[model samples]
Each structure stands twice: as C-alpha cells, then as structure tokens.
Target chain A: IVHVMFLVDTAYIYAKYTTGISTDPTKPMPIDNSEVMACGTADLSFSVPNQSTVAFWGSSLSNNGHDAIIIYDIEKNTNLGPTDDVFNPFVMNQTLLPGGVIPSGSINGLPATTEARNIYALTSTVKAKGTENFVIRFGLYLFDAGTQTQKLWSYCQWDPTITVY
Target chain B: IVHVMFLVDTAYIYAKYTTGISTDPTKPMPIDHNSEVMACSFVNKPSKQGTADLSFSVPNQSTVAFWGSSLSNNGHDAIIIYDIEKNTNLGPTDDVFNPFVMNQTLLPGGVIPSGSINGLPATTEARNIYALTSTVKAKGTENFVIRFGLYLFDAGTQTQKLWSYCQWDPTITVY
Candidate 1:
C-alpha cells in the first residue's frame, strides 16, 4: 500500500505544518484571504521535514478558536494531556478523497489501532470566518493489551497524515 | 521529496515522534530517538522562571476496550518535560540536545534540560484534563524545542510509559 497519488490544484497552504498549532511549524506558508487546503495525493501532498505534526485552522470568525489537536486511540487515552486553548482533531469519515472538490463536513472517526481512540481538531466550530484546512500526521501505535502500554510499530503501514477543514 | 504510505495498521512506525506512546507499547519507545519537537503554535513564555504550557492528561476511565491493564491505581506519579527521554523503558537511545539541564538553580539533578519528573494529584478523577505548568530556567533569547511526557510509577523503580508525543514543529523555544 506504499503508493502515491498526484493532483493539480491551488493550495495556498505554504510550507508544512504551517498553522497556529505549534509554537513554530517548519516556517510559514502564509494563508491568503481566499485560499484553503487541497490534498489529493502525494502529487499535491503537503511534504514536510518530519511527519509527526500539529496544525491550526481556527483563525476564522464565528465560534471560539483552537490552536492544537487532541488524539486518543479507539481506547480513549490521550498522549497529550491538556490540549491548546484552541485545537481541532480530524473529523472521522471526512472524505479524504483523491481530488474532485472536497466537502466541508465530511469527517468521521479514527481509522485503525488495536486500541483505537478519537483524534479531534479543536475549535468551537460553525465559524463564519471560514476555517482553514489541516494536513495532519498520525502515528501508527501498537498498544499492548496484557500490558497497558503503547509504542510506535518500529515501522508501520499507516498514513500519519490527516487533512482537517 | 514526497512519499505516500497507507494506513494498513502495520507499516512499522518509522515516525519517531508520531504520537500517543505510553499505555503499554510492545516495541518500547526509544527516548534517544531524535524527537522533532516544535515549540511554535504553543503558548510559550519568557525563558526565565516561567512555565511551558503542555497538553498532558490522565484519563479517569480506562481507554482499554478489548483487553489491557487498567491504568495504574497510582497513576499520579510524575510529570516530566525535557529535551531528552532516555535511560528508561519509555525513552529514546540517544544523547541529550539543548536539554533542560538543572545545573544552575532548579530541582534536583536527573537529566539535562529538566529535573526529575513531577508528582501530581493522586486520584483518578483528579487526573483529568491536566494543564502542565512546567517551570524552567530561562529561554536564552533563542528559539528551542520543548516537549511533554507522562508516566505512572508503580511503587518500585518501575515506570509505566503513559504518553509522549513531541513532533510539533520547532520544539519549545523562546524568541
């Protein structure tokens, strides 16, 4: 499953993890007034230095804004204790299709992980200011049952990426 | 340049600082591994005697659905924030970097950029949504890396890796 996809869209996402989530994300990818995110395949993927990342998209107007992310496996445990005042996890089933006009509310839940948990992109939601999209990176954890522990698979076939709008 | 990987649930976690590793990882998380921690986007303070706001928490209920050891009855053990997480079952196998050393005037010596871990509220419910207030020396007027880590000591010298993720962006630093 280690394949790649390609696309041709206008993504004003600049740099990588370029959001308000981390104190600093690579550098800066200036988000213009009328630009969102576009993730079709590796062709138009947000290539970054490392993969593990945290992004922000609450600069809009409406509800309260978030600046980080909180992810739990299917088990409901958290790696990050208290998330940023403003952060939003990925929306499960939020159609991450292969380019063709992505929707706004097409998220659902965390995909896999033996003891799967939920990952959320913080923010009050329903913003009139229009929310920015995020291309997140997730770890493929291996949580042991007998022992209440979780570790990265040394190597795994999981997409450490999550695009949030 | 660009790479495309699948989420087949078993691709081998090459991502050192991916996220969520502490419950009971089969392949112990190496603390010496280069943690790509970024401080940007986080609420930071002056490098002086200020605190690094972290998003670490202990769940009141068990996240183990199928079968996993319940959270330690004494989960409220320590809260550590450092530039290195080595010499333990839940750390990397590398040397420390611009670590949070306590050589000047801080807690007892243990690691580089930080002191011994923290011991917080000792109750299940009390361990809810924690706001990690890590007091440190000073940020030397330069940008740096700062990450969060959680653990549950089981009486003896045994440490249960609870949770650790530090792949934000630029690590914890002060500009």
Candidate 2:
C-alpha cells in the first residue's frame, strides 16, 4: 500500500492549542486564517495509479507519553467538552477520497513510535478522471493513556492535490 | 455577464430563508444556504466554465445594504460594487439593462465598493417585487458567504430603516 506522510510539528501545535472549536469567538481557530491557525501551508501532492491503496501517515503520536489521536469522525464528536459547535468533516464529498473515507472510530490503538500512526487509509480510484483535489480535515485529540481521556486540541484541514490516472 | 437573482417574500419576513423546497420543517427561505439554492446553477470547479447571475429580491420600496455582504469569507471583494445593478424590471436580465437603473453608491470595503450601496425599489404593481442583480464571475477557488442587509421605508415617516440581515455561504471553484 502506498502511503503519504505528514510530519506534524507537535511542539508548534502545542504552543497554539488553546481550544478546539473554530467559532470559539474569543479563541477562534478559523479555517484558513493565519493569525490564529496552528497548521499553516504544507504542500502535499502525489500521483498514484488506478486502485492504489493510499494511507495518510502522521508522526509524533507518542510524544510526552501521550497519544496524539487523529479523530476522523469530527462531525459526531465535536460536541464533547467545551466544543459544542458543529464542524464539518471530510466525508461531505466522497469523490475525492475514492476508497473508504476513514475507518470507524478514533485511530488511537496504533503502534506508538517517534513519528508513527497510519492516520487514514483509502484507495485512489480516479479511473477516467485525470486529477482530483481532496480537502483533508480532522480533529487532533491529545490522549492521556492512563486516564483514557482525550482533549480536543486542534482542528486541522488542508487541500491535498491528488493526481490519479 | 452571467447573472442570478434571489426573490424574497415580504409577507414571510420572519420566516427562515430557503429555496424552492426545504427539508427543515420550519419553512426556511431561499437565502438560508447559497450552496443549497444555487447548487447546480453555479459551478464550483475547474475545467467547467464558471459564471452565474446572483440576484436577491425584496418587497417594493425596500433596498439591500451591501455593507455586511462578502464574496469570500476572508472579507475580500468578489463582486465589484459598481457592477451591482438594480433591475426593477422584475426578471432576469438578458444583455441589456433596458428599464433597469443603477443605484447610488455610499461606501466600499471587503467587496470592491461593497458597503452602503443605494437602496433598490420594487416594481410598481399590485404585489410589490423588488430585486437586485449582479454578474458574478467565478474568479478564485474558495467557498464564500453571501450576506447582505435589507432596508425598508417606514409607512408614515417614509424614512429608510433596516429590516433584517441575511447571509449564506456559497461554493465557487474557479480554475
């Protein structure tokens, strides 16, 4: 299976992790707004053949003895703690992902390493179409392994230009 | 220039905005969601030529203030203020503004000359129908909000007063 790696700078992200919801009014983390955003511009592009199983991999999940959980089901779990507002997830458009959008629940039980975690996996099946763009959006939850509690820290999204032939 | 118009019912000013049909049992108006109302009419993608005529209508003697409206969510000018025309003809424009008249300009900001544009009057008839049309060219690739403020004249004093502010986000993908 082909994989696209995303090395998340946990140090830079922790510095700006004040709240999770974007419409926090006081501590809002807007979609593309720079001043209040933790994830800026990171170019991610890949060309895969027909029916290539692509996995989106991210790094630094076991930092500080805590698991950096990648929550794909952001729409359902948005109303967890202080995060009461509804934020749209990535499954709105299925044509982009082509394969299975995301697994079912939180991707937390994966192997812990310095930079590990196959966040999400899908098959690139743009048979007739030449290129497609996918807006990858998800919520990052800092999980305390002992307490089994995860705090929604940041909501990240980026448009990854994908070319499949 | 391609153009689209939104017709509002003055009688149901208190109701939420929706299009031809709505699933939300509360009877929302067409202005609630631009993505829902103008879904197929306005193409938001590359390869396909993107052009649309976005128009909004209110009752006669009522005008929409352009201050709170925006083409992009980032407070940028997508529709030039000067290009916004008041078409009292009460129908879609072809290639000319035959009986339509351009309104006055008061202020400009996010959308070029986007703030404080003149008020539009409704057509003279038994049932008043006022409308404003603008030729919007899909220039960039982004989803933006279509927000505007409405104004109506007082029956006694004839003084212009704001009625309500309505807005919705629409997706426009320009390649």
Candidate 3:
C-alpha cells in the first residue's frame, strides 16, 4: 500500500519581460510583465520506488494563447511537461481552459495517490503583452506563501512531506 | 522560456472487492467480492528541460471529488497518488462532508479568476486524503474551467523549456 500527500508552499508567477514589452516586433507583447508566470513548488516525501510517476491536475482560467500548468522533475533536474487535458464526458467538453477547472487529476496518466518520487511542474501561457498576473493556488496539507522565500526569483522553497510504504 | 500542455485521456474507477453478510469472519472468504472506484489520467507536453515537480489544485465546488486527471513521463508509465481531504478549506458554516458549489464570488481568498487554480495543503494532516474536484459547465476561450486547470496542475514540459539556462541539480528532500 502507498500513502501520498501534497502541500503547496507558495503560489506565484514569473514574467519573461518585466516591462511586458516584446523586443521582437514579430512577437506580441504580454499584457502585464508583472504577472507571475513561473510554476509552483512542493517538497514530496515518499519511499523511493525503483520506478514511479508524479502527477497533478490544473486549468487555465483566462487566456490569450497562453499555456497552462508546467511540471518539473526536481530529482532528475528536468522539466517533464504539461498535464494531459482529460475530457469530461458528463460535461461533453473535450477541452479544459479559460475559466475551466481540471478535477482531482493526475499526471502522465497516473493517479496522485500512486507511490513514487518525482518532481513536477505547472505553468501558464504569457497572455497579452505588458504585465499579466495569473493566480495559481495549490491543494495540499498546509500552504504559507508569506514565510516562503524565492530562489533567484525562479523557484521557491515548497517544503511538504510525502510518506511511502 | 518553457511551455507546457496537459491532456487527460481517461478517468474512471475499478472495483477491488465487496463483502456481504458472511458465514465466517476469521476464515478466508470466497474470492467473489467486487466494487468500482473513480480515477483519472492525462498526457503532458513540455518545450524546455527534462523533468519537473508535479502538483494538483481543486476548486471548492461541491462535486470535485468524483473525478481524476493524468500526466506523462519519458513515456506514459509514471503515476502519482494524491490525498483529497488534505487540500480542502471548509467554509466556516459548512460541514466537511456536505456538498456545495464553489462560489467564485464568495471564496475566502478573493474570487480567483473565473477558472484560476487556488488552495494548498499546509500540514502533514492535510495531505492524507483526496482533494476536491471541479466541474466544467461551458466551452469558450474565456470560460472558467480553463483557468481552473492551469491553477490545479503544473506543466513539467514548459518548465524544462523555460529553465533551460541552468545546470541540472539533483537533491532528495521531502516537504
């Protein structure tokens, strides 16, 4: 049997350009450079199985051609990619975005309750040009963004506990 | 620098076993029990780095616990387990087991954009159960569910692309 838990440390975003202006004329400027675009972090603790997958669910509330949820692999120091968009048959909706919400989801086709050790990523597309701030909230045991600090403005300390048996 | 996209392929549950009034409590019962549980899966795509830390978010909608989502690894074999009870923040007057829709206008932390992701488990106790689930009601570029998906799960593929400038580091620390 395997037991898993998720704790959200900090929920924020990162911008490509602080001014939200694109230097390249070919690229459209972001609405707000101040919008937080980076993914959130969590400290996962579980039995290091020979093999396992880390997963989660997410949605993009609003968009202007922005990508949603980026998963990062911290153990191997790599970025896996986006979580699969599950089609809800009841809702008859094949796509999830813009004011949409993904349910008690998973990643790489695995349940969040699976036992494994792997870091994941969640990200959103930089909509408009200028500064656009996106809101990312985490579902976990405890989340204290106030005390959490950033690592070079790219990553933050998301200390959470994971137990495996 | 990084771009991420997630796609959920399947979501359902299977029955492991069932029990009825049995003749014996100590003896091994016949292998004839069955039941089904709800589950979900997904596929993810990233433009940058190799791997990332995966996380999930759920809205306060009354019916958010009945579904699940999916992800991808080097291939599509990696799976993660999540506890639902750990991530919920019940309303002051609401019962924990009672069902209710998440009011975008009444959420304590301020109404998240129509479809934005929110909430987190802050303690070990909060991480022991399944998180709530959100429902999809419409289809549009500006709909509320899209933002909901973005906030709940992270895209590792996108992170890899954006964080491509740094040297890789490996560390084993649990929060």
Candidate 4:
C-alpha cells in the first residue's frame, strides 16, 4: 500500500485570488480549476492492491489566517481513462479522516492538524480490478471557518495506475 | 497466500450423466452446478490484506470462469477482494502449488491464463486436469460472492459441452 499527500493552495487563493467571489451570502463560492492544477496531480503507482491516503493541506499556503476545511461530500469519476473499459467508483473505497459523523458520511467542524493547519484527509483501499489503468477523478470543497460557508474548489483528479504482470 | 482447490467430477459425471441442462433454449447454458462433494466456504476472519488461490481441476479439456456477486445484498458492507488474475508467467517450480507462503503478495497482491469486470475465464495450461489456478485478493470484509464455472466436454462427442457454476460465501458479517 502507498500513502501520498496532496497540497492545496486554498490559503494563497483565498488571500490573493478568490476572496469575495460567491453566488450568495451563505453559499460556497464556485471556482473552476478543474482543467488546471490547484497543486499536484496526486498520481499513484503500485504493483498490488494497496491502501493509500490522499490528504489536502492548506497550512503552508496560509495567508492572513485563512485556510480550508475539506467538505465531506466528494465526487468521483471512474470512466475517464483510455483503459477504463468499465466504470467503477467502488474501485477505491473511501473513508473520511477521524472526527467525522457516521452513516451520513459527514464530518465535524474544521480541525487544525497536529501541524496546526486546516486539513482534511481521505483514505482509500484501492483495488486493481478490471483494467490495468485505473483512473479516478474527484474534487473537494473548501469550507470557510469564519463565515461557516464553503467553496467548490478544483475538481482535480488522481491517476492511479497498477502494474499487471 | 492461501491455496484452495475445487476438484470437478468430470470423469465421474460425464460417464454416468449424458444429458445437459440450460437456462433457456435461445442461448447456451452458462456454467451451472451444485454438488455436495464440493460444498465449501471461504472465511476471511482477520481484518487484513490476504491472497488465496482457488484452483479448479477438471481432469479434461475445460475452461474456468470466476467472478464475485452478492449472496446477501449488503452492498459495500461486504468483503472486498481485489487484484484477482491468473499468473501465466510462473515458473514450474513456483510455490503456488505446494507449501505456500500464504502472504506472498501481502504488499502485496488467474490462470487464463482474460480479465473482465463481470467474470474471468481461464483455459487449460500445460496440464490437462489443472485448468486454472486463479489468485484473488481480499482487502477486508466488504461483502461479495465468489462464483466459479467449470466448462466440460463429453469424451464420446467433443462438441457436447456443458458449463456448470458453483458459488461460495466470502463473508459472515454485514452492517
């Protein structure tokens, strides 16, 4: 199993780019960096079925005490690759970080990590099922701690490939 | 990786039984069977990563198909087994046959020797009776059914073929 961390520049974007962009006073702001990169691609490569962790951190990008808390509701796309002959979102089983609600897949308010940064982590036990090239596309929403609101950040993706012998 | 075998009574069944059964006339009967002799179950007690071999020996010309389904439709709450396939490149002296290490691919983690989402089929390798030795991975108790099919041909007439299925429950808990 492989563990990888993905860094999101929520603090930089919040302080410099998308400060006042929102549709409503209470709703999350909409940002479309789907076609681009917020940080890294979070690509993974493994030879066997493995458990991996994809964490989004905004501590170092913190600007003027602004960071992001990840929203629990994540969207996954499993049929966007050349070898993806079969669509399987279940290709990777997801589990939210600690301090989350059950059944609802909901988590508590944003908690600073031991590193003192607003962070969210999701772990998945990935399987090398069906195709050798297993591609998953998903995005995270950034929750604002001050206003109790959120923003739909980048619809980024992780391209995890497995070696079949 | 643990090794398990499914021995078919092709030699016995073909000699005594000459008739065949089907799901419908329009299509050929998919592999189907239920035998008290091969009655067994797969137990994934510990919560860990493991691998097991479910080898089928037909003692004749045969093809084997393996897939996972729901015996008790508990959705994702059942056991999840991944990275299942046939190891065609294994040398003759490879330990997949005897005194196995049980967690060889614990990093870790098929016979025909083709792959698919719905099912996988393995044909006869170098050995006649040993049709396929499929290796499957279990990540945890995520719940799923393991089904196998044995394709057999009649000795008297090679054209007369029958595919029979057998299933086993891979889990005992659901919540």
Candidate 5:
C-alpha cells in the first residue's frame, strides 16, 4: 500500500562502469498467495563479471514476521562456482562485508507483515577478470513473531538468469 | 574419494541377503589402514555398492543426477555434485567443491516448505528407497574422488549447512 500510493521513480543506485543489471521491481516477489503465512522469491539468470556488482531485488511480507533466504548459484557450480560459506556468511565473505551487506535483522525494504521489496547487492570476491555465471534462487520463510526469531514457513522462485557484468 | 567407504551395512546385506559382513573393527570400516567410517546397524539406514556405478554417476550430465543402487536411502533438502577434477576446484582450498546442483526446492519431494525435517518422516530413518529417479551418460571418466555430505538449510536464513561431514566419502573409479 505504501509503495504504490506515492511511487514515482525507481530507487536504484549504480556504478560508473556498470555492464549489466537485473530486477523485477514491478511484479514484486511473492511467496504465499493471500494466506497469513507466506514465503516467496524470483530468479533471472545473468552474469556478474569480475569487479562488477550483482544486485538482487524483491519484496517479502511474512504474516508471522520471519524472512530467511538461500541464494543458490547454479551456473557457478556447473559452469562457474558456488558459495562455500557453509554455516557462516562471514566465513565465505558474503555478509558483514564493507559495502554490500544486510541491514541488521532485515532483508526487505519494509518489515514483516508489510509488503515491500528486498534490496541487496553482490560483488565478485574473485579478483580475476571473468564472468561469474548464475542460476540464482530467492527463497523466504515465516518466523515466530513474538521476538521474530524462530522460523516457521518456506517459499522460493528461480525464474530466469540475470547478470551484473 | 569417489568410492563408497562402508559396504557391509544394512543397505548392502539386505539387497543381496546372502552377503557377509566384511568390515574391520579397528576403524569399523577402514580402507586405507588409517582411514575409517563408523558402521551403523540401523536396519533402515542408507547403504551402497558400485556394481551399476555408471548408471548413477553423472560426472558430465548437464542437469545433475546420482547413483542410488549404492545409496540405499537419501533426502529432499537436495544434494548436488561438483566435478572436482582431483585438484581443479573452486572451493576455499584444494580438496573441496560445491555440493548442491539441486536443492530441496528442486528435488523428488513435493513442494513442502521446510520449518521441520521435511525430507524424512517420523516413521522413517533414511532418504534412499533403493529406487533411483534418473541415470545418464558419464563425463570424461567424470572420474573424481567425489567427497560429498548431506546439507540442511537453516531455519530459513538462506544459509546452507553440511549436516554430516563426509561421514561417507567415496573415491570414484568406474569399471
């Protein structure tokens, strides 16, 4: 309701030598239909060349107030590489990074129970010059609302491939 | 690391019903003297063999597939195979590679979102049913010491976990 009432221009920020961009801002990522508990995602296969930025966008609303995600890089495993940060994102240099990181306990632009898009960016950890392929997957789950800590449900979408090269 | 470690477990003996328990007690099921894998006696636990290895080892299949004639049981959180050419890999170091070609979201199990152990039931113990879903041609010998393990996606933090660390490692050498 808030995003559409006074929506005007896109709130996207890009780099100087941007070679690729991927998004689905219009038909925001949806998890459950209209049920109290919902989890959803969207995917687009694209490339993020070395030194470039990969941006994943979506809007998640959890009735039970929980949002957890698992982004799988398929092409990378088959053609490129996969994120091996097993348990800790920090160990894999994914989250808690300098520039592109998650905001506290939030992954969406708006809080749970509220409909809004998620915003995140990725840069190649690889220093070499090459394209990082992907079979991107976006998934979410509901949570125990009192403290919004414990998890509850699940839903995801692996649409198409999008690149950031 | 491409061959299955323990052979005399429940899955194996049941298939043949006439096989002997050929296992070493020192390591339970040791292969290289110093290496070992503790044996489990759970009647419903997973077990394996390499007779129809080519039918299950998809070293070069475009879409990932595996061998289960050996895998007596298995699950839906999904397991992927990355062809680690002995030394050529994309992992943190030299002996590892990615393990998810298809996640729970892309497996045999139905679209049951997880918040619980969705892969197995309260009455079940393992994931393999001795029945496989697919098998294809192999890749360039697709020969790899494919060390893999079961993974669990956290409560939904989008984080993946190696539930069992190569508890069962296999060294591949197709005959």
Candidate 6:
C-alpha cells in the first residue's frame, strides 16, 4: 500500500522605505516605518512507501505590485537552512489592487490565456520505507513605482489538491 | 540583497507487484493482476535562476500515502527517489491526508505546537535552501496490503514568501 501526506506554512513581509544609506548591504533596506511591505511563507511534510510517486498543486497573488511562490528543502537541523538544490519556483506577475482577490483558475500573466504559470507538479519513487520532510516558502512583494498604487494577491486555496498513484 | 526562485511540477510513480500463493515451499511468487500489480510514476521541477546558492520551497499532499521531497543538482531532477538523506529530503512524515494546508505558522498535521516533534525554535534561521523534486511509488506486497492515495493541493490565494541568502555561511558546509 502507498501512503502520502501534505504540509504547508505561511510567512509575511512588511513594506519599508530606503533611507540613510548604509555601507552594509546585507542588512534589510532602510525603512521609514510609515512604508509597508507584506509577504508570507509555507512549509509541508509527509512520507511515502516503496516505489511510489506523488504530486502538489496551488496558486498565489500580491496585493500591490508583484508576488512569488518558492519551494525548498530544509536540512535535518531544526534551524531553517538551505538545501543543496531547488525543486520548483512559480512567479505571479498579475496586477492586483489593494485587497483584490486573484482568481483560482489558470496561472495568470502567461502569454497564453489558457496557460497558467501557477500550477506546480512533482513525482517520486519510494526506495525504502521511511519518512521525508519538505519546506514551502511563499513571498509577497509590494512595489510602489510612484505612478499608480497596485496590490498583489494570490488565492490557491481552491486548487489545493494532489493525485498519487 | 538576496534573490531566489522556485519552480514546481506534477510527479508520478510506476511499480510492479507480485503475490506468492502456491503449494511448493521453494516456488517463487506468481505474477497476476490479483497478486502482481504496477503503480504509477512520479516527477518534479523547480524554478531556476542565474546564480548559485539559491533557495526554494513548495507545498504537497499524498493520495494513498506520504512521500519525501528532495533537492536536485540540476534544479529539475530527483536526487533521491524515496529515502531521506542529509542534503535531500525535507518534511515531517511520508504519509499525508487530503485537504492539507502549508504555511509558516502551521505544518502538516495541525498548528505546530510549541516544543512539538516537528516544531522548531523561533531563533532558528530560516536560511536553508533545498532544491529537490517530490515523488511517490509502491513497495511489492506491502503496497497491495493497503490502498495508497496521492494529491497536490492548491497554492494559497495570498502570496507565499521564501527568502535565500546570496552567500552561504562560511562555517556551514552546505546551505
């Protein structure tokens, strides 16, 4: 018999402004406190039996400028670290007004109207019986070009489903 | 400033099953639909960038059982098909139920309780970036014993945030 599991996590990034130039680039850009930036993160985990495959699906949006959804593998250590490699990356460039909702159909911003860049997929074959851990990180970036204020928003709650055989 | 990207794709698994039902003691298991069966195949693909030491993240679910998520050197291949290794494999367990939710605050089962088995300290640095694919398959008779289900849920409507450090920690071997 095959066993499958699903996991998720969310994170947010606040809006900030750049000022008082600093020599240290590693530090977060200077923020005026009044400016606002928002983002989110998600993590998932599960196990698979021998010789089995699995898949994942979801969607997202940004409510000002642009938004991106990134997936990664965290090491065994409890601290959030980097994996040697990357699995998948989905970007959403749709234009969303403040508090606007990004639809739940195909991935928007693709050249093809029917095509969706948000749809994500993966597969695996179980070699042995054991457990596996995975991390999912979501990021939302709000950009103010000074011309028109735009919001970025993504709603993948409806399409959240997976198929394993 | 740090820049990172992640790409996700659908995965499948294929397998063959066999059952032993005979009078002879040494006879091997026979191959039949009732006894022997084959499962599906699995695959995974993540986003790519121009620089190295990039970070990635994704949310997934299982139909029959739980599977593992691993990173790939190529950013689009499965390094470890099923087993969990130091560099590869990330998640709490291999078995996942339907309608699962993934976010920074919560995990697979429910709200990640403080001091829980899957819980991590707040001081923990969210810097580890693993690039790997997700997959699931069958295991001989054991697969036939229980039914398996696999599925990938929809990405949240709101933007999901994942960050990566441009430079790895000098003290750390891999990040």
Please say which candidate is ahead in DockQ: 1 or 5.
1
TM-score of each: 0.23, 0.27, 0.21, 0.24, 0.21, 0.22
The runs of at least 3 residues in candidate 1 whose Cα sits more than 4 Å from the true structure, single-residue gaps closed, are A1-165, B1-35, B42-128, B135-175
What's the lDDT for candidate 5?
Answer: 0.23
Candidate number with the higher TM-score (2 or 4): 2
Please tell me which model should have the higher DockQ, number 3 or number 4: 3
What is candidate 2's CA lDDT for residue A112? 11
CA shift of A145, model 4, Å: 11
Candidate 3: fnat, from 0 to 1? 0.00
For candidate 2, chain B by itself scores a TM value of 0.30
Cα RMSD for candidates in order = 21.0, 25.6, 20.6, 23.6, 23.1, 22.2
Relative to the real complex, the DockQ score for model 2 comes to 0.01
TM-score for chain A of every candidate model? 0.19, 0.45, 0.20, 0.36, 0.31, 0.29
| Candidate 1 lDDT, B1-175, residue by residue in tens | 0100101101122234365464332333434323221111111121323332222112222110100011111112222222322223323322212232311111121111011111110111110111112232332222333232333333343333344322121222222
Candidate 6, residues A18-114: lDDT per residue as tens digits?
Answer: 3333222222232211111111121323344445443322111111012222221112222334322222222221222122111122221111111
Per-residue accuracy of model 2 over A1-165 as CA lDDT, tens digit each: 343333333433555555555422233343331111111122433455545444443322221113232313212222223321112222211111111111112221111111111112222332432434344444444544454444455556534334433
Candidate with better DockQ, 5 vs 6: 6
lDDT of 2 by residue, B74-153 (tens): 01111111122222243432332222222222111101110111101101111111123333332333344443333332
Candidate 3 local lDDT, B116-166, one digit each (tens): 221111111111222233332221111011111111222542121110100
List, residue by residue over B1-175, the lDDT tens digit for candidate 6.
1111221111322123222322221232222222111111111112233222221222332222112121211112211111112211222322212221111111111111123221221111111111112222221111111111111222353322111101001000101
TM-score (chain A) of candidate 3?
0.20
State which candidate, 4 or 5, has the greater TM-score.
4
lDDT of 2: 0.29
Q: Give candidate 2 misplaced runs (Cα > 4 Å).
A: A17-42, A58-67, A71-124, A143-149, B1-175
Which lDDT tens digits does candidate 1 get at residues A1-165? 111111111111222224442212222122222221222232123333222333222110000011111121111113434212222332321111121111112121111111111111211222222113333322212223343333222110111222222
lDDT, candidates in the order shown? 0.21, 0.29, 0.21, 0.26, 0.23, 0.21
CA deviation > 4 Å runs, candidate 5: A1-50, A55-92, A95-122, A125-133, A150-152, A155-157, A163-165, B1-175
